[PDB]
Every structure is written in structure tokens, then in C-alpha cells.
Amino acid sequence: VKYEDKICLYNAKGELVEENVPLEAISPLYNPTIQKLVKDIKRTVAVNLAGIENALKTGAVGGKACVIPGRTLDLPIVENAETIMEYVDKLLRISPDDDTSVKLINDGKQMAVQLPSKRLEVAAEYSISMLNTAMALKEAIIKTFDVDMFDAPMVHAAILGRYPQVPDYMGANIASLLGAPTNLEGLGYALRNIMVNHYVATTKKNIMNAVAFASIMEQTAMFEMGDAIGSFERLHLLGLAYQGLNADNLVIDLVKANGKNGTVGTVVASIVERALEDGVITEDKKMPSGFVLYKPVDVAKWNAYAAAGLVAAVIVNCGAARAAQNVASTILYYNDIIEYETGLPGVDFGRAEGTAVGFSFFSHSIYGGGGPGIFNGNHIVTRHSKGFAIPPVCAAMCVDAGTQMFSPEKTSALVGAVFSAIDEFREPLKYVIDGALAVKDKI
Amino acid sequence: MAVQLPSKRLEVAAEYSISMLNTAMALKEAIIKTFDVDMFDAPMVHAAILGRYPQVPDYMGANIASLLGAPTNLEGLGYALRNIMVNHYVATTKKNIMNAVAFASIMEQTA
Amino acid sequence: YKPQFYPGETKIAQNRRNHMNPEVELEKLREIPDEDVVKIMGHRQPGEDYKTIHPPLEEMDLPDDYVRDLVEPINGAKEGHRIRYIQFADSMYFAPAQPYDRARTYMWRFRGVDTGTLSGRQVIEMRESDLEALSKNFLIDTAFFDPARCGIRGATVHGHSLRLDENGLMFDALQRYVHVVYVKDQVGRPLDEPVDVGELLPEEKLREITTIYRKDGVPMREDKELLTIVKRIHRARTLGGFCPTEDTFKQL
Amino acid sequence: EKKLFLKALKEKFEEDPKEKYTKFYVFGGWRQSARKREFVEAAEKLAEKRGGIPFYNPDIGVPLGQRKLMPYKLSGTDYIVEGDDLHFMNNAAMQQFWDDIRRTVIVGMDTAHAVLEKRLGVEVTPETINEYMETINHALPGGAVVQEHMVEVHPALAWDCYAKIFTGDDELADEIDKKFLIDINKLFPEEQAEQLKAAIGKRTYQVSRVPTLVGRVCDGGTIARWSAMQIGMSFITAYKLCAGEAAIADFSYAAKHADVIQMGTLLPARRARGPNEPGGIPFGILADVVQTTRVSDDPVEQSLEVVASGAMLYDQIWLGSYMSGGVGFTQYATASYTDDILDDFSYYGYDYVEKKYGICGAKPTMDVVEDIATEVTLYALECYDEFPALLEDHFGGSQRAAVAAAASGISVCMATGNSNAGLNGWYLSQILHKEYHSRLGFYGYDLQDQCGASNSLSIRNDESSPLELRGPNYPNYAMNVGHQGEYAGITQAAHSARKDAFALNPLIKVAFADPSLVFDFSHPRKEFARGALREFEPAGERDPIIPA
Amino acid sequence: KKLFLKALKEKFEEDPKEKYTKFYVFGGWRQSARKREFVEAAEKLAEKRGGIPFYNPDIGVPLGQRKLMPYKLSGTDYIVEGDDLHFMNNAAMQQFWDDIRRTVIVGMDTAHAVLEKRLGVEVTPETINEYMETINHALPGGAVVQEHMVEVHPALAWDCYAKIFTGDDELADEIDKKFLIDINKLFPEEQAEQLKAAIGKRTYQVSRVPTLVGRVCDGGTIARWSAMQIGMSFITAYKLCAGEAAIADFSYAAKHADVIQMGTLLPARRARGPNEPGGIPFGILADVVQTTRVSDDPVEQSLEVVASGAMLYDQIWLGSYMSGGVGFTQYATASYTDDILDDFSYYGYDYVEKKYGICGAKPTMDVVEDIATEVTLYALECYDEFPALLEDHFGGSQRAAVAAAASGISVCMATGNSNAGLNGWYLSQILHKEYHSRLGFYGYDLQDQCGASNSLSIRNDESSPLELRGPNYPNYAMNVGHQGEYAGITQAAHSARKDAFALNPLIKVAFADPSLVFDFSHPRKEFARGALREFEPAGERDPIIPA
Ligand code: F43
Ligand SMILES: C[C@@H](OP(=O)(O)O)[C@H](NC(=O)CCCCCCS)C(=O)O
Ligand SMILES: O=S(=O)(O)CCS
Ligand SMILES: O=S(=O)(O)CCS
Ligand SMILES: [K+]
Secondary structure: OOOOOEEEEEOOOOOEEEEEEEHHHHOOOOOHHHHHHHHHHHHEEEEOHHHHHHHHHHOOOOOOOOOOOOOOOOOOOOOOHHHHHHHHHHHHOOOOOOOOEEEEEOOOOEEEEEOOHHHHHOOOOOOHHHHHHHHHHHHHHHHHHOOOOOOOHHHHHHHHEOOOOOOOOEOOOEEOOOOOHHHOOOOOOHHHOOOHHHHHHHOOOOHHHHHHHHHHHHHHHHHHOOOOOHHHHHHHHHHHHHHHOOEOOHHHHHHHHHOOOOOHHHHHHHHHHHHHHOOOEEEEEEOHHHOEEEEEOOHHHHHHHHHHHHHHHHHHHHHHHOOHHHHHHHHHHHHHHHHHHHOOOOHHHHHHHHHHHHHHHOOOOOOOOOOHHHOOOOOOOOOOOOOOOHHHHHHHHHHOOOOOOOOHHHHOHHHHHHHOOOHHHHOHHHHHHHHHHHHOOOO | OOOOOOHHHHHOOOOOOHHHHHHHHHHHHHHHHHHOOOOOOOHHHHHHHHEOOOOOOOOEOOOOOOOOOOHHHOOOOOOHHHOOOHHHHHHHOOOOHHHHHHHHHHHHHHO | OOOOOOOOOOHHHHHHHHHHOOOOOOOOOOOOOHHHHHHHHOOOOOOOOOOEOOOOHHHOOOOOOOOHHHOOOOHHHHOOEOEEEEEEEEOOOOOOOOHHHHHHHHHHHOOOOEEEEOOOOEEEEEEHHHHHHHHHHHHHOOOOOOOOOEEEOOOOOOOOOOOEOOOOOOOOOOOOEOOEEEEEOOOOOEEEEEEEEEOOOOHHHHOOOOOOOOOOOOOHHHOHHHHHHHHHHHHHHHHHHHOOOOOHHHHO | OOOOOHHHHOOOOOOOOOOOOOOOOOOOHHHHOHHHHHHHHHHHHHHHOOOOOOOOOOOOOOOOOOOOOOOEEEOOOOOEEOHHHHOOOOOHHHHHHHHHHHOEEEEEOHHHHHHHHHHHOOOOOHHHHHHHHHHHHHHOOOOOOOOOOOOOOOHHHOOOOEEEEEEOOHHHHOOOOOOOEOOHHHHOOHHHHHHHHHHHOOOEEEEEEOOHHHHHHOOHHHHHHHHHHHHHHHHHHHOOOOOOOOOHHHHHHHHHHHOEEEOOOOOOHHHOOOOOOHHHOOHHHHHHHOOHHHOOOOHHHHHHHHHHHHHHHHHHHHHHHHOOOOOOOHHHHHHHHEOOHHHHHHHHHHHHHHOOOOOOOOOOOHHHHHHHHHHHHHHHHHHHHHOHHHHHHOOOHHHHHHHHHHHHHHHHHHHHOOHHHHHHHHHHHHHHHHHHOOOOOOOOOOHHHHOHHHHHOOOOOOOOOOHHHOOOOOHHHOOOOOOHHHHHHHHHHHHHOOOOOOOOOHHHHHHOOOOOOOOOOOOHHHHHHHHHOOOOOOOOOOHHHOOO | OOOOHHHHOOOOOOOOOOOEOOOOOOOHHHHOHHHHHHHHHHHHOOOOOOOOOOOOOOOOOOOOOOOOOOEEEOOOOOEEOHHHHOOOOOHHHHHHHHHHHOEEEEEOHHHHHHHHHHHOOOOOHHHHHHHHHHHHHHOOOOOOOOOOOOOOOHHHOOOOEEEEEEOOHHHHOOOOOOOEOOHHHHOOHHHHHHHHHHHOOOEEEEEEOOHHHHHHOOHHHHHHHHHHHHHHHHHHHOOOOOOOOOHHHHHHHHHHHOEEEOOOOOOHHHOOOOOOHHHOOHHHHHHHOOHHHOOOOHHHHHHHHHHHHHHHHHHHHHHHHOOOOOOOHHHHHHHHEOOHHHHHHHHHHHHHHHHOOOOOOOOOHHHHHHHHHHHHHHHHHHHHHOHHHHHHOOOHHHHHHHHHHHHHHHHHHHHOOHHHHHHHHHHHHHHHHHHOOOOOOOOOOHHHHOHHHHHOOOOOOOOOOHHHOOOOOHHHOOOOOOHHHHHHHHHHHHHOOOOOOOOOHHHHHHOOOOOOOOOOOOHHHHHHHHHOOOOOOOOOOHHHOOO
16 A cells, blocks of 8 residues: 555446545556456457458458469358367467366357466567467467478468568458557557557447456556656546446446536536545635636546546547547537636646647548558557546547547457457456555555 | 576566666666665766667667667668677677687577 | 636637536627528538438337447437538638637537548538538528638638728638628538628627737737646646656646 | 570680680780770879869779770670770660669559549549649659649759559540540550450559659658649549548548558668658569569560660669679679570570470479479589680689579479479579589578578468569578579569469559650660660750759 | 848838839839749640640739749848749759768778778878778779779769868878868867867768769669678778678778668668668767857857758758648748848847856756747737738748747847757747737647657656757657757757857868868858759769760
């Protein structure tokens, strides 16, 4: 117990679970389910057996529109998904009691491969999961269908794509939630390279679950990046609890208060009132014209409250329009209003606003970006805010009625189907609360 | 100095570069708080520890080192444990043939 | 809690506060029929049905989400109408409305808003059905717009920072406006039916309604309150970025 | 039978090609060459411009011309050029060959049309397509379309820049003007055009060629970005949408990531480069750049024309400059496309295959690979033995090993139609060549050849790949000369035997069939001859903005 | 009198204080001499390109609805057309970048140590001069050890050479004047003493590879091209075995251990090798510009660096490499045309000299806040007093960049701290936003809203002295009207201190070389020469192409 701070745990439905919970019970350094989420993300791979079969049958391997004539292989892979599953398990398993898991999805058209944790314990990075699964698949297919020596390279091309010529996965039929280590924007950015659409697809468009999932990952990445070291730790912990894990039902209460006829401004007024009420902020000086300049009592807790209000404002505004495209404007002017309403710094001391400025630019211009769901913490446009801008973006894509061209239905079909099946991934907030109550007194 | 992060920090980390980042941050805060370094001078402390980061995606002119190179300089996927210089193996083993062979072989085969 | 909206001692800052204040309903200085508005917008002809991008929410099989269903969607989202826009280029020469002023006002007064601030243009993207309604009821009707100083333009927005013409109107490379009467839609396509927007306000009349600081008008250096607030925000951001501790924040 | 390299050898040497004796040190050194004289004279004329700073001097180091300095006759042509004129720095055609590839980018238009009709509600008609195509050919060379007070790029520097359209849907092709369309039916033979349209399907693609000057001032990574901006601008003008809204970001994502086809991919940190660099171009894609397939029914000619383009790009430009620099690797490449030596070896192999297995007559087996590769290698090395003059032409062991193994590999592909079978044949040729003369190539020529046999038919993550998907970034191939170009040749040989229209990407095959290109990709060797004789006019020259 | 008045004179026919003018009466595009040449050239070239349409002003926007402005380059009496300041139409701008790209510095001490310690071959000035005479034959593409070698045409590589420089004066005197970049002969005595004190007794080789190489290939080729020939020259000038164990040490030194490159490599999303504009930090670019050793004027030095910076980072880098098309010419011109930034920076300098004195105040929040507010207020009141000046800088981004540049430069003039000036810049941006209720384009302030927090931050990807920041710094990786001005603020911190260099003294010495095509002492005047087509660049293929 390094911090005196206490939090009340409320769920996705707004029901109270437990009171007087230490803040550190939600820390990635103590919470067991957050540890399970990281471990599982690193060891889970989504396999498209249907894709591998179609790629081998047509000879369409190595990226977009690339086809090799005369190298076709007609193999009943999907039909024999059972034997392939058993083969993949036999190759990846160490002991008959480890977490090695190979599950068939959508009538054997897709597979969900989970490496035993021990393989990762002796691995420097996460890319092992993609490599070992690919190898396990090649050997499984080649041995089952007695594939000839001169044809076997096409099996590799159907699974891994244009590797090793391309230092990325190009035209591959196996996917992870994490991108290649070579596409990292900075050091320790690995857990930020999760597309918004992937979070939304996995959580099955559940706002609270998507916010929780994105916040958990973004904040755990802030610890990996070293941004949560020392004096900054308490800022990110309060950020994670109030913004992502609905601490004291703050997010929900703000949505409840402004969901009916409330605007972004009304949410700003609601959070300022609650912040003043809880003694998080106070009046510095009364100025001419009657404007009161405010000063923070608890800088870290003020940012946490403001961050919670940001998620709430996105839910309210994007929810009123049922369009995800609004998020970039919402994040911007939520922060812009809150600064000229109180004279206090915005979420992430303007970084969240700055991110939103670039986000608006790269979601309404010719220079780059795209639709809200295409972004991630590792994108050049949305890396600036230290875990406070991506979770609200997830809430906008959850709300969207279908305005977007690049929807999770188009970008995250495979990943969505595999990860939504896992209980902790689909409903993170629920298991994170249970995990907080599991280590509550142990800290 | 020889800094060893608690294993738990790596258990919640996707890669190994956390050790270099957390130590650098721990050092900055240690030096700044001990010597009461001014706000306008503190960026030089960062530059003295991490070098030309974040302008360079590598460690350029840094005063902290690891046996493992940056994840961005990987020749292929899963090559991380292979990015250990021959001289590093020999220096660590104190020029003992059997120990250097063992160390290089362990790392190469685990990779 | 009663909102403060914006800091500042001057009337310019007070006009910004009045614009942001949803309780303050400014006078209808002009009257433009809705049919003429729809034609200026140019996304559909008056009488043409509303184009739908997605089916109505009432017919969508959405799973249970307690939090999601706390937000009552706007009228345009309920029927699943198309997302269209309206863009304004405000003159730096005493225009009643300004880019960041517009954005702050929209985010304070309206629901389901997607607005974009730029130096030479200010876009507002919303559900077509409610957008026409808000364009007509606020943007067109209220004291916010001046036909001579606020030009409606979707493309070729150049003119916000340019000198006025021989008449006193703002520059328009597509001459959308020429009584102040528009001849073309915001895109550039000439209208078969021109639209009269009414009279223009003289410079001397616009000084008391404008939301811009100018030397010839109200210099910003005269408003020391606003300057103290900006300097405060800048300092708070700097200190916060350096160390987010209460000890450092004593240097405010 | 009659040998093919005799017509170039007798025209090169005064002695009988079979004679193992000659006189030396009696040619006057460097003075024997007309080009060396021009070099020593231009170095004297320019000595004024550099200040007192020394420049090109043949007295420094090795006295060149002790040996008979050989000219070079480009294979399949009657052009006999000087050795120094085949260096890429002195050859404008070679530079334009690379410049044309580098400035090429293909963008899928279907996704963008879907954004217009499904999200914006704007109908896409051939009339709007032709207008878009009229607008892009004004914006792509650097012309303003929506903003006031815009500067513009001088059209005399961007005449080579244009944007064409091609489609597999013949209903859409007829509704487009002949000026803007790359007609698959008008450019390709009946069979080939049908195979291409069957592979492409009912999908419309835009081929944008950015001005040569851009890739020259900047890099290859600029091309896809330059194209994307102007594509985005043209959809704003030709459809009169808002000059910056939510749907525009979708056009950017499709043009830059989702529907883009680039010549080359990015590279790792040690050889860090953006897309559209030679290193990122796979052997299959380069084989599809070369248009000899649609102008000749000769399978050997097709393969060898790809070898010419490959050895020049990969060994001269890529490994000789990008990866090394200096004097470069001109002769390492020339050996593959000069004096009809590789032609003779590949034709012998083709005639051996035809009379034993037949073209595509044998399924790939170890015994087939071993038989063909051994026979072609033995013939090749016995030709160097029967002709001391031929051995004198290919003085470097690397050049001999590359040529012998290229023909061996091509022949295996002529019999099997499998790129990996030909690749395995290549490695056996290298092992045999090493034991024949008790020598192979330079100090480290066989790194990939000793790893070869094991990685040719491997299934491991960084070892496996069909030769079409291999390239200059394949681990074993990332460093050494006399391999990459010949591998593209073996890749073409597998498909030439099968009478295939394309090898890996049909969009590349269609894109480079375009007569609007500066370089003629149908006859690369003849074009290198034109560049060597300074008869070739390239693009990207700054004469309109430079004082005369 | 305001400095932009004498420059606004030939631009506008009316009084700069006039809020009214006439429009739609200029005959459109036909008002410009350049546009006429463009249309005419598009008609002449129509045959050679086939029936394929080309440049046509009738397509899209009718240009010339307003008086199309020419541009007078700051500090010069040259008034050029707007289109001539575009990097594609300007040969001087292309050669500026080409000269930087083809530059590479290699430490010679390590290579000489291999010769003496390992090989046993003694290194004497006689062998150095022989090496330097061999490298100037090998570097442009000349054979030295192998028989039957082809060669590069010398008329395409006349711009290529290799010079030597050293901090040890006892070694400098024993080298030919032709091969040496004399620090004493090129720099003033005090600056040369500061440079030699920073360099120390270390010998460096500056190799300039032919322009044609960087044009055909890329920046990543340069260090490799230099390394091969350095290796070759050591084999020949020291009569070594043509391939032995010690040769590999020369390769490692020239390519990794002792190499100094202009720019570093970039991450996957903007993947590029070394020697690309993105990898060049603000400190290094400030050291490329040689205005410091030809002028005692601190403001001129800073603004000349702004000129070089805005043109490289916004026009070449962000306008082409990162975007392409019409580009960002006007976004950059605003920083080095009509003496507007000059007037604002001079006002700020005179304000500083009065209230604090140059390097008179230690960096504090109160100092930063006072200077940054005053300079911004003056700047925005100048746009208010002159509707014509506001008409010149029509784009909000241009105004914000200029106002904040002068604000930041002024803070650096008073403090001598790059990060203090950087903080001043961010306050100027926040103030400018509340002044006119507008700033720049849609996403101009991403880095400005993250600015104040990351200016004095200590976090791993937020912290860095401005000298070590560059186009790859997270917040600066995308947007225009920042990078060039940041290089200017970086120069301003050292200009106030009367420093010889800002970050790397080897760069300062390397670019002082008169053998370079572009004149780095006067970048603005050289851009004027390029705009008027009186600049002759290198890398032209005229000796190998038909007339
Ligand atoms: C279509 C866009 C959306 C987008 O993504 N970029 C555009 C256009 C793009 C194009 C214009 C191409 C053409 O004319 O064919 C280019 C030149 C980049 C390119 N593609 O090569 C550019 N802008 Ni724009 N763009 C500019 C600017 C601007 C200013 C113009 C304000 C005004 O009142 O005129 C505004 C932003 C703002 O309001 O702050 C702006 C927006 C816009 N800019 C709006 C067009 C608005 C309109 O309808 O006129 N640019 C500037 O702020 C000045 C420099 C100028 C750039 C050209 C140069 O630097 O040489 C150009 C930079
Ligand atoms: C965001 C990113 O684009 P993507 O979203 O990856 O397509 C990136 N663009 C840029 O940073 C463009 C910079 C130049 C144009 C904008 C000037 S404000 C790039 O092309 O690598
Ligand atoms: O002599 S080496 O084999 O090292 C180089 C051949 S060019
Ligand atoms: O209009 S945008 O601000 O997106 C681009 C300005 S060039
Ligand atoms: K180039």
C-alpha cells in the first residue's frame, strides 16, 4: 500500500460490487486478470483455415492481387480441421497440463491457437506465437495430406505470406492482436499496436467493455514505456480506474445525468461540479467580470476526473448522433471547453486535445489516417496522448450505427471471432473487478 | 551500476526494452530530485542517459546498455536473443572457451 | 453550478460568453425560408426525400447495453439519415461569428455535433434532417451570421483574411453572393432560383457584436483578464508535463 | 551444332577463339580505348571548374590496358558498345529503366467508387470517370484544382508524368477514352489477354506515373504518397465534394494502404529504405515488369531478357550502388546479357530438355533436377575449356558460375515449370562448378549457394518461399552479386515453359505494357545498347530551369 | 519605419492600411508571366506525350481572382514570381538538399591506428597527401587496383571531391591547400578557436559523393559509396594486400565506428535510410548554415537558418517525401519573404536588449511569459494595422508560424536556452488562438497543444533539448510551419551566446568549404538566384544525352 487512495467498484450495469478498495488493486503490477490479459494476448493467434485452403487452391499467395500460376494445391483442410487441430496441439504442447489450447471456430473454417505460457517465458518478444503456430500448421498440413517437397513452399506462402522478403505479415492467413515488432513507433509501444476495431469486435460493441479493454492495454503500455514511473504512477493508476474501470460509477453517473438532453458542454459542467464537490479542485482567484479562476487540489485526481468526463462526453455526443466520426471533434472541444471554463489544464495536460486536433485533421483530409476505428496507440496521429485518447475512440465505434466504411465487420472479422470467445477478453471490466477483489487485502 | 528490474514488471510487458526505459526514467528522477536540477536544465539529464532518443529509433550516445539490441534493429521475427555481440559473450565469460561456447549456444538455440 | 463559459473583462469576451451560453437566445436579424436554405446547401432539392445510409434504430437487433441506452439519440440518428455539412468563412474584419467561437458555441448548445475549425473555414457536419433545422433556426436566423462578413462556402474558402471589395463584401473566388443576394450554392453550381438574405450590418454596428480582437476594434492587450487565464493554462500545462505533483504546482 | 558466342568472339579478338596463346604489354595501356581518352580529356577540361583539386587520372594505381581491353556486344543485337558505356552512371537508358519502375504505382479504384455511392451517395458513371481521368492528368504533374493563389510545377519538367486506367471488365473499358486507357486486348495476344482478365477479374485499377524528377530529388517512398494526394484532390474536384470531410480519409487509406500496389516493399534497419526501392522488388514482380513475353513466342528469349533487366537492376544499380557504390559491378552483370554466351548455354539446355523430357513434360523430382543441372553445367564449363578466348571474356569466376548456373536453372524450369526446382538446379550447378575447376566465385560468392540446397525446398519460416516471392531481401540473397538477376530469369523460365501471361502479379504485367512509358520494356537489351551509344533520351532533366 | 513596408511597396498599388480593393478584374491566370510560360509549354509538349491531356488552367479553380503576388526574398533586393520558389522549379533549392545529402564525415585517426598498431605501416603527411590524391580519383569513380575496370564519366562527377580538416594545426600545415578545409582561413579567430577546442586533435575526412548518385539512388547510398572508395584508397596509397584481415577494420570504421551522417534512419511508417531530411536534427541543420561566420548579426543568423529550415522541412520533406503534389511552397515562403519575420524578430531583439539584455536573464516562467506575450502581441497588431500584410500571409498557419518563430527567437536571445525559446513558441500559439479565434489549418496545433507539457518534460519520448529534436520527434512528425522555425529557435539560443556551432562542430567546418556548389553562407540570396534561373546545379546528364 504505497497510496492512501480508495475506490468504489461499480460494474457495466452500474451496480455496486464493493466499497473501500485500494487503488493498487487495479494496477497491472498487482491485478491478476490484467496479467492474464497481457499473457494471453502475447500467446494467442487467430488462424484462417478457410483462407489457407482458398490461397492454396487458387495459388493466390504473397499479398494483394498476387497469384502464382501452376503452383495450385487442392487440399481439404477445412474438412480435416479436427486432425489438424490435434496435430497443432501435439506440436505446441510441452506437458499434458499446460495452457496449450487449440479450438475450432465457425465449423472449422477458423482456429484459435494459444501457445503454452512457458514458451513465452523463454522468449524475448511476442512474435514467437505467430512463428510457432505457422510452423505447427505447415508440419500439420504437409504430414496429413502427404504434400510433395517441390509444392511445400506454397503451404508456407499460404500461411505467412511474403515472409521473409517483407519484414511484416503481408498476405498471411494467421493474425494476432499485436502488430510486428518492426512497425513500433517507439520503444515499449508493442501493447499500443492494437487497432480500435479489434477492441470493439472482441468486446462485441459493448461500450464499457471496449473502454475497459483499451484503457487496460494503453495504461499497461504506459508502465512498459516508463511513463508510469515514480511521481507519474499515481496519475496513470487514477487514469485507469476512473476513465477505464468506472471508479465510483463516475463515467456512468455523468452519462446518466447528460444522456437525456445533455451536450459536451453540459458534461463539462457536470464533471466540474463533481470535482469541486469532492474537493479535487478549488477556487484560486475571483477575477473581474465574475469569472472564477480554479486551481487543482489533487493534480493527478483532477486529470482522472477530467478523463472520466471525456469518456462520458464521447458516449453522450457520439451516442446522440450514432456516428463514430464525431469522436475527434468531441475529444478536442471537450478538453478545449474544460480549460476555458475553469482555467485548469485539460486531460493529459493538453496532450489529449493535441491528439484530437491531429485526429480531426487525419479523419477529414487527404494526407493520411482514415476512419476512427483504423487508429491505435502506435499510430503516428494518435500516440501523443498517454492512454487517455484511445479508450474514448473505442466507445464511439461501439455506438456507431454503420456510418463507417472501414467498420470492424470489414477490418476485424477473424480477430473478432477468435477473441470474443474468450470470457476475460469479451467482458474485461467484470473479471478486472473480481481480480481487484482477489488481491485487495494481499497488497 | 548494475540495475535488475523486478521480474513482475516484465511479466506485464510485451518486450524486453522496458528494462532500458524504466532504468532511464528511474535515473532521471533520482538525479533531478537529489541535485534539485532546474526545469530548463532537466532535458540534458535525459540526453545524457538515453542519447538522441526519440529522434533516433535506436540508442545513440546513451550511457545505459543491455546485452540485447533495440527491437527495431531485428533482421527477422524472433531474432531478439540472437542480437548479442560475440565480444559481449567473451567479456561476460571472462575469455573462458567452454563457458563462452555454452553461453552463445544456449542463447542461439533458445532463439 | 452555473457555468462561466469564457474569461475576460471586455465586451468581445462577453459576446463569446453570450454565444457559448445556451440560455441566451440572440435576435432574429434576418428571415430566410427553409426551401432556400436546402438549395444553398445543395445536398438535395426541396421536396426530395431524405437519403438513408443505415436502417432506423427501432428496426436494429442490438444486444443489451445499459450505458448505451442512457443516451437519447437525436432525430436524424433515429431515422438513419445521411451525414451532410454547412461551412462558413468569417471575415477577420468585425464578423459577428468566429471559427473557434462557432465550434465552442456548437459544442455547448447542440447534440451530436462534428465541427471543424480552420483559419479560413468552419465546417459543421451533422445528420441532414436536424442540420437543415439548426442551420435555419440558429446559423441563418440568429445575430451569429452577417451576409457581407460571413460567406457560406463549401470549397474555395479563400477570402477570410483578404481586404473587402468596392461594395464592402468579403472576397469570393466563385462569387456565390452579389440587397445581399446569393446566386450560387456553397459548392459553386449556380441556382435556378436566387436567394435574398436581406440587409448587411455596417462596420460601426458590428463592433458591439463581433467576437474578434483587433487594434482598430478592441485590442487584446486591453483585456488583461483573458491574457492572465491563457498564461495560467500555459503554465499549468508546462508544470503538469514536468511533474504532476502538488509541490511543483505551488510555482503557478 | 554451331555455337552462338562465335559471332561476338571473332568480332572481339584477332586470334582464333581456340588458341590458348597471345602477346601482352603491347597495346599502349589505357591509350588503346576511345572512352578512356574521352575520360582523360574531360578530366583535363573540368580541372578548371574544381579549382586546384585533382580529378580522374589513369597514372594513379593500376595501369589499365595491359590486357586487351574488350568492347561488348549486347546479346540478340548487332550493337557492339564500349565497356564503360554499360556502366549505369554513364547509361541514360539504364537510369530511365529504374526511374520508370520507381515512379510506377497502382491504385484500386473500386473501393473509392464504393465510398462515393455507399457513404456519400454520389453516383459513379463512366462520364465522371473520364472527367476524373482528365483532372488527375492535370493534378499528378503538379497542377492546382481547388485552392486560390497556388504555385505550380513547370510542365516541361513533368511531361513524362501521366495517369492511365485499366480494367478486366470489358463493359467499363469501352466506356473510357483510348487516351486514358491501357487496353489489355489491343496490347496483349488473345490467350494472354484472356488469362490476364481472368486473373484480374471485374476490377478497375489506376496506374499513376509520377514525374521522374520527383524520384530523383526525393526517393521511392515518395511515389505512393505523391500519387495518393493528387488522387484525393481529383475526387474532390471531379465529384465536387466538400474540400475536406470524413469520407476523404477513406480515399487516403485506400490510396496509401488498402488498395495500393507498390513495386517494392520496405526493408529492415541494416539496409533501411522505403517502398519502391530495388531491394523490396521480388523476382516475380520484376519478371512481370519485362514485357518480352507479349512480343515473342521464344521462351529462352523471354527468360534471358528478364536476366538482362535483373542483373542490371540488382547487381549494377542495387548491389553496385545502393548497397556498395564506387566503380560498381558492371562486368558482373554484363556477363549475363553480352556476347550471346548465356544464350548459347540456355539454348543448348532447351534443346536437351525438348529431346529428353519435353517442355513441361516432367514433374519435378530429384533425379530430373540432378540430370538437367549436371548436363547444362558440364556443357557450359567445357565451352570455357574449348575456347580460351571465351574464358578470357568471362575472366572472373563469379561471372562464369552465374552464367553456367543460370542456364542450368532455366533448363530445369523449362522441363518442370517449377521455380523451386530450377532454384535447386542452380545450387547443384554451383557445387559441381566448384569441384570442376577447384574454384567458384569471389571470396564470399557461395554463401547462398552452400545454404542453397537446404533452403531451396525448406518449409522453415525464414528459409521457405516460392522463388516468385523471393527477392533481394531474402536472408541468403541480401548481400552478394551474380544471383538476384539470374533468379528473376529462373522465375520467368518456369512460366515461359508454361506459356503463362504473367508470373506473380498481372497488374504489373498490364501496367508496364503501356506505350506511354519512356523505356521500352519489351526489348531491354536493345534499349541498353541505345543508352550506351547515347541515342537514348531520358526524362527528369532540369534544362527548362537551368541557364544555357 | 517597419521592415516589411519597403517590401510591400512593389507588391501592392494601394496604401498598406487600405481595407478595400477591387477584385475579379485581373484577367485570371493571364496576369502572371510564369502561368503564361506554363500554358504555352503545355501546348508545345502536347504532341510528344501523345493525345494525353496535360496542364490546363480551365480545369478546377480559376486562378487569378485576386492580385497574384510576387515575392521579395528577405534581406535581398530580389523580387521573384511565386511559382519560382517551388523546389521543383528551383535548381538552387534542389542543389542545397543535394549538397547536404551527398555529405559524409569519416574519422581518420582510427584507420591510421589500424595501419600503425596492426599492420605496422607508418602514417606520415606524405602518405596522407598521396591518399588524398588517390581518393579524389576513386571517389568520382576511378579504378586503382583491378585490371579491365570500367569507369564513371568525369563530366558527370566534377562536383565530387574529398577534403580533410583537423583541430591539430601541426598536422594541417603539412597538407596541400587543395585538400584542406582550413578552419583558420575560413572562420574568424575566436570561432576557429572554439571549433578546434571542441574538435580537439582529431583528423576528419569530408567526402562529397557525386550529386548524380543521390539522384539515381538515395541518401542511404552516400555513406556506403564513400566507405568503398576510402577502403580502396588505403589499399593503393599504402600498397597493402588487396583483401586481408585489417581491411575489414577500415570498413567497420568508415561505415559504423567513425562515421558522421547528416541524418539518421526512420521508423517503418516513414521508412527511409540515413541522410534523408527526416533524420536531420534541428541542431545539425543550424550547423549546416554558414551565416554565423560571415555576419555578427544574431537575428540574421537565426532567420537564415529559418529560411533553410522551412524550405527543407516544409517544401522538400513534408511537401514531397511525406506528401507530394503542389506542395507547401507558400507555407515556407512566409518565413523568409518580404522581411516580415525580420521585422518581428528585430522588434523582439530590441525589446529583449532593453528589459533583460542578450543572455542577461536566466530561464524562468515569468521571463518566457513576458517576452513570448509581447512579441506575439506586436506581431498580431502588425497584421491588424496592415490589411495588405494580412493579405500577404492569407493562411493562418503562416501567421502563427511567423509570430511564434519571432517570439521563440526573442526568448532565446534573452535566455540562451533552446527549450526556453521552445516554451515561448507554445505560449505564442495559445495566445494567437485566443486573439483572432483561429490559428492554423485543421491539425496545425497537435504539437502546440502537446507543446507546453512536452517542452520541459523528462519522459523518454517527450524529453529532448531542441538541438536533439527533429522531424522524427513524435509531435513534430506530421505538420508544417514548425520544423524550420524550430531550427531557427535552436540557432537563436547559440547566436545570443556568440557560439561558433550549435550541436556538431564537424558539420560547421564541413559546410564552410568553398568547393560546395550551393553557398550556405547566404541561403536566401541563393534561393533568389535559383528562382531567376541563374543558378547552375550539378548532376545533369548533358555529357551522355543527345542535344
Ligand atoms: C482541399 C484542402 C483540404 C486538404 O486536405 N488540403 C487542402 C488543399 C491542399 C492542396 C491544394 C491543391 C489544389 O489546389 O489543387 C495543397 C497544395 C497540397 C497538395 N495537394 O498538393 C495544399 N492544400 Ni491547403 N494549402 C494552403 C493553405 C490552406 C488554407 C487556406 C486558407 C485561405 O484562406 O486560403 C486552408 C486551411 C485553413 O483554413 O487554415 C487550406 C485548406 C485546404 N487545403 C482544403 C481546401 C480549402 C478550400 O476549399 O480552399 N489550405 C494555407 O494555409 C496557405 C498555404 C497553402 C498551401 C500551398 C503552399 O504552401 O504553397 C496549400 C497546401
Ligand atoms: C499520418 C501518416 O499517414 P498514414 O495514416 O500512415 O497513411 C503519414 N503522413 C504524414 O505525416 C503526412 C505529412 C505531410 C502532409 C501533412 C502536412 S500538415 C505518412 O504518410 O507516413
Ligand atoms: O576479393 S573479394 O572476393 O573480397 C571482392 C570481389 S569483387
Ligand atoms: O484543410 S486541411 O486543414 O485539412 C489541409 C490544409 S493544407
Ligand atoms: K533519389
